Design a protein around this nucleic acid. Structure first.
Ligand SMILES: Nc1ncnc2c1ncn2[C@@H]1O[C@H](COP(=O)(O)OP(=O)(O)OP(=O)(O)O)[C@@H](O)[C@H]1O
Ligand SMILES: Nc1nc2c(ncn2[C@@H]2O[C@H](COP(=O)(O)O)[C@@H](O)[C@H]2O)c(=O)[nH]1
Ligand SMILES: [Mn+2]
Length: 1095
DNA sequence: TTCAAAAGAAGCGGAGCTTC
């Protein structure tokens, strides 16, 4: 009773009765929220939040008094105080818009009159705001406190929401648009990454509002109100922001992008503030004034970020103690601004940075339409990073007179896949530009003698930054290769940088000088290398040179190598020994490093190996069609087209074929992760078409630079030698484009057959509008699929081992079958509860369930083991937030628009997520977590998932630690973890309770194509338990293998570059043995251990 | 079916069907 009259004392005048059993209008705000035991917001109880916070922001003394802090962020100075005054006057405008919209809503259809007479309009999807209004004569009005507090949240969101949005990729955009990932138009992905979908905008806004309101949710109130009221408020504020043009609304019609698509999708983009807006230097004053414990803030000095209790976006999953330990260690790391890079960026200027690293200024008529769009996105990324870096520099600059001495901490959270992600869009972990300006790495080096170990480390850092592949050569050979570069092509750039570090000035041709010197070595870290080398050259005391230059220990083909180590489940084979050595697991070779392996044993990494297996598979495919001239010719054209535009494919003088590890990298990785072959083909084609769209701009350009130039010279001039030599390239291009768009291979009964499309490419090429579209894209894709990708996937399987493929399949099926049941049972338990609600007069459709009831249902699924536990990590593969559960609107704005679907945290099908969740999680995820918490964990590093940036003083020990952490993670057994969960699932699952939809879903994973169609519950059941048996056997094999491997002498250098491998001190010596010998010895050990258990 | 976050709009009526 105390909580009822407690919230009622604060909001005495709201309309209705705070009793769900009441007869007249019930107030669902007071029914839904309670006062927190401990204060969360400083506006609770305030009668005019906007006036009170404006007052608070009016001066440093008033701010300090309001927040009850003795000192305030020094970035809150005069200039910024003035901007916040203006922003506060704008909050008055948004408030005034909101009040008018309510008035309009109350008047239309006489909703107001009707509400007054007892019509329960405060329960409509569009009338939930009626729960925070107050009677005012013959009409109603907002409660001023709730409204003004909501607006303050509107203001903060407006200020920083953009810099916290998720990055969207082709996959997301496809889902959003309902358009096939492979067939997405150019820059359509870019268009969507720039904007926020309705859902995306309202949910972040609503979160902020509910947070500033500073109340607590009633565990016994219907979600329709606890989520609904704050969301109805956010929807209104977003609408107000559109009227005021702080937010631009764009309704994107798919019908034009694709005739059959009926979706029209809203995109919301927040208007940009000027880059030189004072508010950028301290964009969180409001958050920090309103919230007792602010989330949005920078962390300077010994202001350490708190440690997150739950997995990122999986509130059902608690961060394990080991994970929380790792998060604490990373958040404890101090970052410092490298002043010379900041000065270099400033001196170059945003515009020359774009010209150097972006796409420069765009001549939208020397550019192919599609090329133009890809370049715009490029500039966007660089421009945003630039602006975000200098907003941070501004705030740091105020904290003291020397910005290089201000320690900066970053918040981290653990993701669904066990990775420690730095919060924020633009930070050192996620933005290369920021990465070179704000570093945790620092070292005092003795570079007075080029024969020092310190100088050798300096060299390694420089070479790696300059795109020398340092893990493929010894330190000594690296040295010589660096020297040749510094004295050769780079010297002009170096000299310019020397001058910059003397006078602070750059020449007007600086971009030209850099661009020419670096060539394809150009990058932000390369700029750091030039900067740091030059600083060294002008250094006064070379004996104590201070630099944040780093060396990154980076995993060699990490994911695939981890999968092979973690999930290969049978006896040892010689191929496995040789292949895994490509990833740094060396057997019987004490102290062997990746540098040595690559320069003396095997110059081919896992990607090159799969590329070599692709060539064999291609050759095999050719023989099977050696007499079929049309197919031979089809293949030749696909290879010819790729050759023309991709660097990783070369076709020799005599038709010889040569492939670089490049093409195999992505396909190898994602294939293991469950990617279809079709998805891969679309990617390859997209990379071809992109190179093509570009060459078209090379035409438009070189053609306006000389209206005399021939088509063949305007397109293949740069790539050819003579004139008629370019005429045959133009002849190939055209031949290839027509044959690959007019004819496609289809696989009928095991054999490939060419079919006509009737949609072949015909017409004179117009370099500006030229665009491979729809049916022509699909055709290129079909050819890419069968003549390239399928051979590649055969090569991939041959490389990583059919045994790994088998493990990942069982893993995939198990986790999938489990997610289907979890999803289905959860929906059914929900439908059952909603059926009970129809018996309830107090309840109304739209109210949905209480958090309590959802907690009950989520808890009833516990005996199906939704979580996978490793002992230091927890994975919840099925976990998601989806609209399919409630299948209804949560709220709309007051114009009956902006209809937000009611989204619920609930399990959903995993598809193939099981593989990468477990592989990334127990692989690199576990290594990094281990690296953070292990005895003598390296300090002052930046961890980027599968690579670690290390200061030049500690490269050797940190590197060995990294490799030890790799070994530690290779003690894992993800299949065993999955098994332990699936086994419990199988003990409790009732397949008969499943919807026929769930049943077919399961049958797809569990049963062969044939046995499906019309199999019984019992057929599924029996099949689902076979998978469990397979899992148990794999898990046993993995466990045996790891124990056996531990008995043997191993040198592990998976985190390569520095050449500091981890030795495991196996007692059994396998040196001076061929892989064949080794595999036999290991297999003996395997059998004997297999017996230790059998008895 | 790669993973790391989801995600149509809007008239009429007061939910949820419907048409674009
Ligand atoms: N597109 C992707 N999809 C899924 N996982 C990815 C993707 N890109 C990277 N990863 C994961 O992150 C890891 C690190 O990727 P990285 O860019 O370092 O390449 P890599 O696979 O380590 O090979 P290398 O480092 O030799 O180029 C990968 O091994 C993989 O597990
Ligand atoms: N799981 C996953 N990781 C990625 C993906 N792209 C990049 N990464 C991770 O981020 C790293 C790239 O870092 P950067 O390219 O910013 O230097 C990769 O080494 C990898 O660990 C991706 O698409 N999926
Ligand atoms: Mn790597």
């Amino acid at each position: 009773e105390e909580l009822k009259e407690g919230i009622d004392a604060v909001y005495p005048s709201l309309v209705g009765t705070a009793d769900s059993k009441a007869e007249g209008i019930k107030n669902y705000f007071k029914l839904s929220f309670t006062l927190p035991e401990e204060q969360k917001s400083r506006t609770v109880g305030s009668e005019a939040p906007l006036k009170d916070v404006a007052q608070a922001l009016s001066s440093r003394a008033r701010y300090e008094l309001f927040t009850e802090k003795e000192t305030a962020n020094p970035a809150f100075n005069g200039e910024v105080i003035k901007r916040y005054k203006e922003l506060m006057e704008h909050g008055e405008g948004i408030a005034d818009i909101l009040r008018s919209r309510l008035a309009k809503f109350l008047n239309t259809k006489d909703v107001g009159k009707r509400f007054a007479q007892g019509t329960e309009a405060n329960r409509w999807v569009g009338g939930k705001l009626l729960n925070i209004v107050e009677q005012d004569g013959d009409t109603f009005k907002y409660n001023e406190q709730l409204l003004q507090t909501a607006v303050l949240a509107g203001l903060q969101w407006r200020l920083t929401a953009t810099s916290n949005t998720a990055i969207k990729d082709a996959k997301d955009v496809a889902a959003i648009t309902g358009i096939d990932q492979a067939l997405l138009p150019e820059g359509l992905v870019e268009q969507f990454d720039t904007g926020m979908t309705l859902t995306e905008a309202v949910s972040s806004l609503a979160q902020k509002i509910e947070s500033y309101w500073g109340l607590s949710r009633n565990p016994n109130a219907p979600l329709g109100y606890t989520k609904g009221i704050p969301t109805a408020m956010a929807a209104e504020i977003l609408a107000a922001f559109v009227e005021s043009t702080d937010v631009v609304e764009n309704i994107v019609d798919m019908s034009e992008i694709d005739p059959d698509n009926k979706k029209t999708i809203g995109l919301y983009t927040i208007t940009e503030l000027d880059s030189f807006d004072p508010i950028n230097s301290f964009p969180t004053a409001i958050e920090e004034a309103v919230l007792v414990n602010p989330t949005e803030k920078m962390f300077f000095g010994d202001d350490i970020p708190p440690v997150a209790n739950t997995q990122l976006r999986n509130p059902a999953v608690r961060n394990t103690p080991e994970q929380k330990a790792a998060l604490k260690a990373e958040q404890a790391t101090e970052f410092y601004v490298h002043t010379p890079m900041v000065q270099f960026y400033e001196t170059l200027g945003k515009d020359r940075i774009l010209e150097l690293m972006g796409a420069g200024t765009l001549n939208k008529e020397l550019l192919n339409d599609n090329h133009a769009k890809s370049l715009e996105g490029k500039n966007r990324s660089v421009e945003d990073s630039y602006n975000q870096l200098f907003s941070v520099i501004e705030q740091v600059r105020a904290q003291s007179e020397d910005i290089s001495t201000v320690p900066i901490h970053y918040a981290y959270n653990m993701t669904r896949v066990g990775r420690m992600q730095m919060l924020g869009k633009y930070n050192p972990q996620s933005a290369k530009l920021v990465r070179e300006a704000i570093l945790p790495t620092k070292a005092t080096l003795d570079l007075s003698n080029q024969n020092n170990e310190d100088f050798s480390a300096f060299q390694l850092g420089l070479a790696q930054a300059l795109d020398i592949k340092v893990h493929t050569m010894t330190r000594e050979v690296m040295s010589d290769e660096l020297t040749k570069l510094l004295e050769g092509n780079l010297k002009p750039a170096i000299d310019m940088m020397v001058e910059f570090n003397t006078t602070g000035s750059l020449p007007e041709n600086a971009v030209d000088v850099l661009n020419t010197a670096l060539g394809d070595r150009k990058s932000f870290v390369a700029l750091m290398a030039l900067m740091e080398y030059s600083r060294y050259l002008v250094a006064e005391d070379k004996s104590a040179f201070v630099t944040p230059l780093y060396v990154e220990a980076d995993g060699v083909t990490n994911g695939p190598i981890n999968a092979m180590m973690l999930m290969t489940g049978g006896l040892f084979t010689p191929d496995w020994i040789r292949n895994i050595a490509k990833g740094g697991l060396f057997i019987g070779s004490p102290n062997k490093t990746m540098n040595e392996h690559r320069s003396t044993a095997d110059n081919n990494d896992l990607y090159q190996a799969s590329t070599n297996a692709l060539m064999e598979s291609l050759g095999k495919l050719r023989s099977n069609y050696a007499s079929n001239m049309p197919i031979q010719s089809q293949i030749d054209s696909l290879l010819s087209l790729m050759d023309l535009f991709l660097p990783d494919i070369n076709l020799g003088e005599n038709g010889a074929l040569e492939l670089k590890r490049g093409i195999a990298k992505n396909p190898l990785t994602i294939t293991i992760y469950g990617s279809g072959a079709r998805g891969i083909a679309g990617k390859l084609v997209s990379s071809v078409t992109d190179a093509i769209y570009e060459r078209m701009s090379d035409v438009l350009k070189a053609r306006a630079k000389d209206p005399n130039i021939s088509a063949a010279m305007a397109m293949f001039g740069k790539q050819a030698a003579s004139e008629a030599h370019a005429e045959e390239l133009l002849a190939r291009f055209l031949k290839d484009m027509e044959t690959l768009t007019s004819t496609v291979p289809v696989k009928r009964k095991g054999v490939l057959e060419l079919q006509s499309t009737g949609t072949g490419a015909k017409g004179k090429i117009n370099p500006k509008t030229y665009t491979i579209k729809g049916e022509q894209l699909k055709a290129l894709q079909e050819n890419m699929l069968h003549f390239f990708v399928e051979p590649l996937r055969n090569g991939i399987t041959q490389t990583v081992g059919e045994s790994l493929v088998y493990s990942t399949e069982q893993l995939q099926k198990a986790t999938q079958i489990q997610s289907v049941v979890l999803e289905d049972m959860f929906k059914q338990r929900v439908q059952e509860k909603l059926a009970e609600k129809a018996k309830d007069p107090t309840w109304k459709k739209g109210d949905f369930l209480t958090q309590k009831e959802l907690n009950d249902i989520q808890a009833s699924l516990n005996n199906l083991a939704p979580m996978i536990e490793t002992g230091s990590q927890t994975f919840y593969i099925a976990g998601s937030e989806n609209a399919e559960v409630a299948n209804q609107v949560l709220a709309t704005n007051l114009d009956d628009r902006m209809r937000v679907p009611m989204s619920i945290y609930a399990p959903a099908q995993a598809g193939v997520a099981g593989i990468p969740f477990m592989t990334i999680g127990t692989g690199d995820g576990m290594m990094m977590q281990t690296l953070s918490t292990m005895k003598g964990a390296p300090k002052n590093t930046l961890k980027i998932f599968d690579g670690m940036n290390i200061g030049l003083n500690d490269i050797t020990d940190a590197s060995r630690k990294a490799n030890e952490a790799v070994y530690t993670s290779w003690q894992g057994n993800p299949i065993k973890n999955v098994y332990e969960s699936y086994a419990k699932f199988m003990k409790n699952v009732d397949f008969s309770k499943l919807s026929p939809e769930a049943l077919e879903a399961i049958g797809k994973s569990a049963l062969e194509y044939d046995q499906r169609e019309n199999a019984t519950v019992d057929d599924i059941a029996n099949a689902a338990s076979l998978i469990e048996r397979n899992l148990r056997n794999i898990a046993l094999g993995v466990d045996i293998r790891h124990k056996v491997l531990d008995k043997v002498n191993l040198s592990i250098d998976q985190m390569a570059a520095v050449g500091a491998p981890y030795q495991n001190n196996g007692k059994i010596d396998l040196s001076n043995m061929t892989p064949e010998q080794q595999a036999d010895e290991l297999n003996k050990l395997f059998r004997e251990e297999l017996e230790a258990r059998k008895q």
